[PDB]
Amino acid sequence: PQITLWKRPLVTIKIGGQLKEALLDTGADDTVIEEMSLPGRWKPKMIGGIGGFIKVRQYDQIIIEIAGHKAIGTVLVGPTPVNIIGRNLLTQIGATLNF
């Protein structure tokens, strides 16, 4: 698809058997999801933006379906105010910014 930016580029994702709404975010290096359970090993991480840092759990090799496209990569889980799909997964679905 071609997604205009008049409003927030929100899409439905499937992660860990759950449906969530998430923001397609070219300004995010990594994908950050609100608190949920994911299988496998994890390690703690601090990530920072406007307003400072939050502590998250880093899960690797997680499969996500993003607007119908499957991708695998790292997902950070923690107290983010919005679910964010970052570049680490946007690349896998072939997303580009065009102007």
Ligand X SMILES: [C][C]([C])[C]N([C][C]([O])[C]([C]C1=[C][C]=[C][C]=[C]1)[N]C(=O)O[C]1[C]O[C]2O[C][C][C]12)S(=O)(=O)C1=[C][C]=C([B]([O])=O)[C]=[C]1
Task: List the catalytic residues.
Answer: 25
The footprint of Cl ion on residues 15-34 (CB under 5 A) is: none
- Write down the least CB distance from residue 64 to Cl ion, Å: 11
Alpha carbons 83 and 73: distance in angstroms, whole number: 15
Alpha carbons 92 and 87: distance in angstroms, whole number: 9
User: Does residue 27 interact with its own copies by CB under 8 A?
Assistant: yes
Q: Give the DSSP H or E segment for 88.
A: helix 87-90
Cα 94–chain centre separation: 15
In a 3-state reduction of DSSP, which class is residue 90? helix
User: Does residue 44 interact with Cl ion by CB under 5 A?
Assistant: yes
User: Does residue 90 interact with ligand X by CB under 6 A?
Assistant: no
Q: Give the footprint of its own copies on this chain (CB under 8 A).
A: 1-9, 23-29, 32, 47-54, 67, 69, 80-82, 84, 87, 90-91, 93-99
